[PDB]
Scaffold this active site. Structure first.
Site, PDB file in Angstrom:
ATOM      1  N   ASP A 203       0.803  -1.237   0.000  1.00  0.00           N
ATOM      2  CA  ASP A 203       0.000   0.000   0.000  1.00  0.00           C
ATOM      3  C   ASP A 203       0.833   1.282   0.000  1.00  0.00           C
ATOM      4  OD1 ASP A 203      -2.559  -1.183  -0.067  1.00  0.00           O
ATOM      5  OD2 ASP A 203      -2.722  -1.300   2.152  1.00  0.00           O
TER       6      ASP A 203
HETATM    7  O1  BGC Z   1      -4.766   2.224   4.778  1.00  0.00           O
HETATM    8  C1  BGC Z   1      -4.020   1.096   5.282  1.00  0.00           C
HETATM    9  C2  BGC Z   1      -2.501   1.200   5.033  1.00  0.00           C
HETATM   10  O2  BGC Z   1      -2.059   2.276   5.869  1.00  0.00           O
HETATM   11  C3  BGC Z   1      -0.668   2.681   5.688  1.00  0.00           C
HETATM   12  O3  BGC Z   1      -0.546   3.891   6.453  1.00  0.00           O
HETATM   13  C4  BGC Z   1       0.143   1.502   6.219  1.00  0.00           C
HETATM   14  O4  BGC Z   1       1.553   1.672   6.038  1.00  0.00           O
HETATM   15  C5  BGC Z   1      -0.239   0.264   5.483  1.00  0.00           C
HETATM   16  O5  BGC Z   1       0.426  -0.816   6.115  1.00  0.00           O
HETATM   17  C6  BGC Z   1      -1.724  -0.001   5.519  1.00  0.00           C
HETATM   18  O6  BGC Z   1      -1.946  -1.128   4.704  1.00  0.00           O
HETATM   19  O1  NOJ Z   2       1.107  -2.664   2.217  1.00  0.00           O
HETATM   20  C1  NOJ Z   2       1.139  -3.982   2.773  1.00  0.00           C
HETATM   21  C2  NOJ Z   2      -0.107  -4.330   3.583  1.00  0.00           C
HETATM   22  N1  NOJ Z   2      -0.369  -3.368   4.648  1.00  0.00           N
HETATM   23  C3  NOJ Z   2      -1.308  -3.895   5.638  1.00  0.00           C
HETATM   24  C4  NOJ Z   2      -2.672  -4.105   4.954  1.00  0.00           C
HETATM   25  O2  NOJ Z   2      -3.693  -4.580   5.861  1.00  0.00           O
HETATM   26  C5  NOJ Z   2      -2.555  -4.997   3.719  1.00  0.00           C
HETATM   27  O3  NOJ Z   2      -3.824  -4.908   3.046  1.00  0.00           O
HETATM   28  C6  NOJ Z   2      -1.417  -4.533   2.789  1.00  0.00           C
HETATM   29  O4  NOJ Z   2      -1.273  -5.503   1.755  1.00  0.00           O
END
Ligand code: BGC
Ligand code: NOJ
Ligand code: BGC
Ligand code: NOJ
Lengths: 822, 822
Positions: free
Chosen positions: A490
């Site tokens: 993400d």
């Molecule tokens: O919206 C959810 C995403 O938030 C980001 O701020 C985090 O780094 C990610 O791990 C997460 O998956």
């Molecule tokens: O960015 C990695 C990872 N962050 C945590 C999220 O819950 C998951 O959907 C995502 O794939």
């Protein structure tokens, strides 16, 4: 170093101190009503949706942590204590918390009085039940007053924490000191208007007194640990008018030496049809029928006991589908109990509500709830089935999807971003896993709407066509798929270029244009496109299947041609066509996601484990040297030390945390499976051990978090807190490690037309027996395992040798004995 | 009961106990940087925007209320205590908190050590300064260690309290024990990435030690009252990595009997140019220059004292524009100090951030900031000019507007709804007041964009046209204005019909169609349509002015023909075209708003106070008999006892609270003004006393909130909590009561071409003098007031009589002596 121990025969983790490194919780419930319960009784409960129907309030980032939950103040002769320890923190002669499957027991004893509470959510019920046992352990008779305590949430958890200018004037309760089974309190905020539901908090006895107003019960200037009412020894009988409604009953107890008493408390979620909301023609008095019924179902100890036994029987039966008996009791406890229990939780919660996820912004993630299927389809296939329909209904006609949906409504929303190009392919992943497991080919025929539109229904298979075609028609210059907002990671936002503080990377508007590509989605397309082609073949779609394998071929060839850096796979091309994850760059040289997923997809596999010329082998060795730590594999190396504007969120974390050099555990099992695919069982199992709760229990003071469940993130080598976890419980690591260990390490994995038995775990587990129920039959798989590098299995079945490693599915009712030699 | 007293000569409220009914706060700062400071040192600070640049963390709904703020732990030979009382709550020999103008002083004494802290925000600084004086008041030497403490917030207050899954891993600090003027801690979360800003927390001495990690300072299982570090007697020198950053320094002092020592602490907000963010080429160490320059401007007590003197001179100067000397010292302290101070706070804060408003959803409101202008224009007119421009810039071309704008960006948003039809007319109210005050007709020529679109600019006057036309072109079947989402009453939602729980009436989608009209907007349009007419005549816009007066006349006639119930004015027509606020329905018979506002507009005003037949008189008599409580006037009567689906949020409140039979004090001044219009001074003054803080101080235990500022709502006669306030400080009641008392009661009001002098206050104020500076000239206005009903003033000016009640503006520099006879 340790703060408790597993109890395998009881299926419990036993916490032997209040003084753990962090609050350690259980989830109660597995259907539509859930509770977060810490080992100090902290947490809250919600019906279906943690944001929209939260019954009881809980404060994140409180001082101290977890000062707030289901409390029972004991007043003994003026001395006030709580058997949960917090909030009062009185010295206890004995303390113990037992976290079990769908229930917990918390015991404290002080000055001749022992108080044990069993907490659980009964099957079939939207309620949290507590059964209290007070025991006189002294040689003399004893008397005490018990004050129960729960703090209500005003249903909308976001409103509750932000909108006091309204909500301090709307709290409403009813008091029922003389009900049919005991005393009850009703929390009924907004039932006056649009809500058809209220909460109840009652006990199976006529309470001496009650309190519904937080300020009267706690007192001015006091914390929970100094509450005035228990110290005074008598309820004030407060009737809330706005401010902060609570549930509390006082009960006086008398006990002879050795004597005990049970009290049964119930927190319930009740609804009435609109027609029947009110008891009176004036519409001021809630209709109490369903609450009287609920409280009547838990009027006695025997009834509580009978529900706790049905819950134990339900867990026995869920866990009967996959078991292992081996020489490694840590491996065993993970496979037989804990990893499957966690898979049940993630299925229900997605990433929505934990002691880290606040149950506000995140509902049911498209990618996350699809991945949770992989770990869940063997537990309750029929619920996996429905979850597939619900998820696929939030897909758009063009194949892309809402990134998540709201649990109460089943409707998609953009609240944490849109246009994540990995999302469409995950739906194929979950359906393939489901059909392999159950053999329910007819699900492909289920009519499913696009974005819940009445009249838009097409078969589920057509939805998979839309996912597949989304990637084929959204490739960039190298033939790799366009990344959009981000892929599985993400924080990789290549279309972002944000300079504005405090707008979420997840949500901020993306730039049009550019040529940004994901090597990760490419590997994902190769793996799951092949699965889609197979689905198509079964459906007699030879035209479709043929074209599909061609695209898979074109993308595979794009990965070798344009996604290979020399010793590992490339990560991406940015907006301007620059490679990301190349040795040519100073930081972010190698990123783990394409290494495991590419090799999972068969990309770059050579002659065997010791084929040193093969990309897969070079990739994994690099993963090993550059990313490995005693705690797991970090996401990339080295971490970014300055903001890289063109990569978005990733370089905004300090080195070693989350996506910037953290161990993001969800992606380690990809490497695990990669290594089994390549024939390096020993290394695969090593990686499994490094991140697995039962193996990290001995370093509890370092992990910090619950030692019985996977966490999302362990600080990586570049962080001063290396080895410290955050974000326990709610992680795809649970579904993905269950896959890894059960299907690729122990080796037992459902296929379309038979059960694959393909151990690859190396020499540290030289024999084991797997019991697997698949399509109505029971496979007894006895494994004798040399652990030789690259050595794969031969099978004899029911006394006769067979060719290869696929046992065709026996009829329902059978027991099949498969003898395995590796 | 009382918990303190006014000190008029010092311009302070003196709180003589920590044990108030509720936390009582002051606001520090009047420019761009602000602190909420309670009498227990509780609260937080922000730069420009409470949501997006919050420096320090505060917990709303904490247990207990208000345990978090700027603390100074004193460890005196092992005893630990705080002069703020909270959080340690150790017994104090003496305690006192003084809230003054832009500063507060909190003093606590225990066991021979007196610790006084002076808090303020200095002029031209983005900083909160504390000057701490420790005095040995014993007869023997003392040694003590002082631990300062503030808890940082990660800037985005919404992300801080909900996004732990990210934010627990991003907190960063730097520690500078040996800085140029003393020790400093830098909180620099997200400075690595998009933020060009950081906070400093410094002391003007070289500290023994420091702490930056909250968990280490406080301790596991501990609240802030039980903090480990101060208890241990020495800092832990903790360096935060993620989790919860804090600022803390330890300073040992030794004092002989009667000796004292000063220490200056500074919490500063700093920015750097992007090219100048980093000390080093590697971009790892923050550039500290502006933080060093800030600490150098407050390195001494002398520098503090000078700043505090400059703050005093600034207030003396602000308060030199309007004052009164009368026989009523309660009236006087409201008019001279408190209500004007409050008006500065509302001008700055709108309704975003208080101990009730959370500084999250609410920014600067369009109606809210327009109405605040009415009580601020005389204080600093150049700042009101700019504010009018900022507001008008959030207006759409059709004349409708964004309902509020983000303080930091000045850009409107719909986070609390759109299409409130009373909005556009308030723009004219604000400009009319401003021009009457200043005579700055040139503002009407200011070029002003719609929705901030560069290139969209038209003259300000043209915006007013759009506002006026919006109402002309949005009338219903009775010729009364179409209501839209709501008028001034946010909870009168006639286009709503919501049955979905949990969804905001403010933001939820509305039905197109129906015929819902508002008598309030009709009254509003008649009042401000008339000002608009006047401004068009003066711009030389004859036809436009003529047309405008024709429209005003139609709408005035429509109020009398269709908006009249018999003994009061109607409130509205619902979606179906049925009357709202009529004697024919059993609940909500009479609503306060159109009664005050139609009569202020001159609708139904007769021959005098004694003409029982004039609709204005009947209306106001109905308001007296049906709406009057000894705490003020409730909004409507009876309150609604069941949810009324056609009416919106209104009936969702329990009876007697907020908009369902609460005293919504903002609309009380409209009735006060109305009463003076019909010549009923005594009754108008009575109504003013009922809600005014100086008169309610003697019932501090009932009112509960600050006894020196107005609150938004006082519980009504149908409330169990009748007379208890909620939502203090941020209310339009401040500006509207200022307008009422200074302009209609006392009777001194600027008009376009002269200063109107028209006392109407009744016989409780028989003689008084007002000193008013208006257009650079000072008016000394001496009033002999019989208070006789309907009796109206005549004037002499500089020894010579004049006609009527308007004194033409004398030229700048002169002193005009006005003798007034009523
Ligand atoms: O919206 C959810 C995403 O938030 C980001 O701020 C985090 O780094 C990610 O791990 C997460 O998956
Ligand atoms: O960015 C990695 C990872 N962050 C945590 C999220 O819950 C998951 O959907 C995502 O794939
Ligand atoms: O959005 C702000 C509005 O919220 C409503 O829920 C309240 O009752 C109003 O008093 C307030 O003006
Ligand atoms: O609903 C009445 C009133 N509530 C409070 C709001 O701040 C104001 O804008 C509104 O006019």
């Amino acid at each position: 170093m340790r703060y408790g121990h597993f109890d395998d025969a009881a299926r419990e983790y036993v916490i032997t101190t209040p003084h753990t490194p962090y609050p350690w919780i259980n989830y109660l419930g597995s259907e539509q009503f859930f509770s977060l319960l810490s080992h100090q009784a902290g947490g809250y409960s919600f019906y279906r949706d943690a944001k929209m129907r939260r019954l009881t309030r809980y404060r994140y980032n409180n001082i101290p942590a977890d000062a707030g939950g289901r409390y029972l103040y004991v007043n003994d002769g003026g001395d006030v204590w709580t058997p949960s320890w917090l909030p009062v923190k009185a010295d206890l002669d004995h303390f113990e918390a037992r976290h079990g499957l769908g229930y917990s027991r918390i015991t404290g004893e002080r000055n001749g009085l022992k108080v044990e509470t069993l907490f659980f959510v009964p099957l079939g019920e939207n309620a949290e039940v507590q059964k209290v046992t007070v025991t006189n352990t002294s040689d003399a008779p004893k008397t005490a007053t018990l004050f129960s305590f729960v703090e209500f949430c005003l249903w909308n958890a976001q409103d509750d924490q932000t909108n006091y200018q309204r909500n301090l004037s709307i709290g409403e309760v009813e008091v029922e000191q003389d009900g049919p089974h005991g005393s009850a309190i009703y929390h009924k905020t907004e039932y006056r208007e649009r809500r058809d539901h209220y909460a109840v908090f009652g006990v199976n006895t006529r309470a001496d007194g009650f309190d519904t107003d937080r300020d009267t019960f706690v007192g001015a200037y006091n914390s929970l640990g100094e509450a005035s009412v228990p110290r005074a020894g008598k309820s004030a009988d407060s009737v809330a008018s706005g401010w902060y409604p609570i549930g509390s009953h006082s009960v006086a107890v008398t006990l002879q030496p050795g004597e005990s008493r049970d009290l049964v408390y119930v927190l319930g979620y009740l609804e009435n049809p609109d027609e029947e909301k009110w008891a009176d023609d004036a519409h001021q008095v809630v209709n109490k029928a369903p609450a009287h019924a609920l409280l009547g179902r838990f009027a006695t100890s025997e009834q509580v006991d009978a529900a706790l036994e049905a819950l134990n029987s339900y867990w026995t039966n869920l866990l009967s589908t996959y078991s292992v008996s081996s020489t490694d009791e840590k491996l065993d406890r993970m496979v037989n109990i804990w990893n499957q229990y966690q898979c049940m939780v993630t299925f229900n919660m997605s990433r929505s509500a934990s002691f880290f996820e606040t149950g506000i912004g995140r509902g049911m993630g498209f990618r996350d709830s699809n991945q949770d299927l992989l770990g869940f389809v063997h537990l309750i296939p029929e619920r996996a089935r429905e979850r597939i329909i619900d998820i696929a209904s939030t897909q758009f006609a063009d194949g892309s999807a809402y990134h998540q949906y709201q649990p109460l409504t089943k409707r998609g929303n953009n609240d944490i971003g849109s246009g994540f190009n990995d999302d469409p392919l995950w739906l194929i992943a979950g359906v393939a896993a489901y059909i392999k497991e159950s053999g329910d080919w007819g699900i492909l025929d289920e009519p499913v709407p696009f974005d819940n539109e009445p009249g838009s229904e097409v078969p589920l298979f057509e939805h998979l066509t839309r996912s597949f075609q989304f990637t084929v028609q959204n490739r960039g210059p190298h033939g790799l798929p366009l990344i959009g907002r981000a892929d599985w990671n993400d924080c990789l936002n290549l279309n972002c270029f944000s300079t504005t503080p405090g707008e979420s990377f997840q949500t901020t508007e993306n730039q049009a244009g550019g040529v940004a590509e994901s090597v990760f989605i490419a590997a994902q397309f190769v793996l799951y496109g092949a699965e889609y082609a197979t689905l198509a073949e079964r459906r007699g779609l030879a035209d479709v299947a043929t074209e599909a394998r061609k695209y898979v071929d074109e993308v595979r060839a794009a990965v070798l041609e344009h996604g290979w850096d020399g010793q590992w796979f490339l990560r991406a091309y940015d907006y301007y066509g620059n490679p990301v994850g190349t040795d040519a760059k100073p930081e972010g040289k190698i990123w783990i996601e394409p290494q495991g997923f590419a090799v999972m997809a068969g990309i770059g596999v050579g002659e065997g484990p010791d084929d040193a010329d093969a990309p897969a082998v070079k990739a994994l060795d690099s993963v090993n040297e550059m990313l490995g730590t005693p705690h797991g594999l970090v996401l990339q190396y080295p971490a970014y030390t300055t903001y890289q504007i063109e990569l978005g969120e990733v370089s905004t974390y300090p080195p070693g945390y989350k996506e910037n050099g953290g161990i993001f555990c969800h992606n380690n099992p990809w490497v695990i499976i990669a290594e089994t695919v390549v024939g390096r069982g020993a290394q695969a199992f090593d990686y499994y051990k490094r991140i697995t709760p039962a193996y990290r229990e001995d370093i509890s003071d370092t992990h910090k978090l619950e030692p019985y469940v996977y966490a999302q993130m362990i600080a990586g080598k570049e962080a001063v807190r290396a080895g410290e976890a955050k974000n326990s419980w709610l992680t795809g690591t649970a579904a993905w490690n269950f896959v890894a260990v059960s299907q690729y390490l122990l080796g037992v994995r459902p296929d379309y037309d038979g059960l694959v038995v393909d151990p690859q775990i190396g020499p540290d587990v030289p024999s084991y027996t797997v019991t697997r129920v698949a399509r109505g039959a029971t496979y007894e798989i006895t494994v004798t395992n040399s652990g030789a590098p690259g050595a794969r299995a031969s099978l004899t079945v029911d006394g006769a040798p067979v060719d290869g490693r696929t046992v065709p599915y026996a009829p329902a009712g059978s027991t099949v004995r498969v003898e395995v030699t590796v």
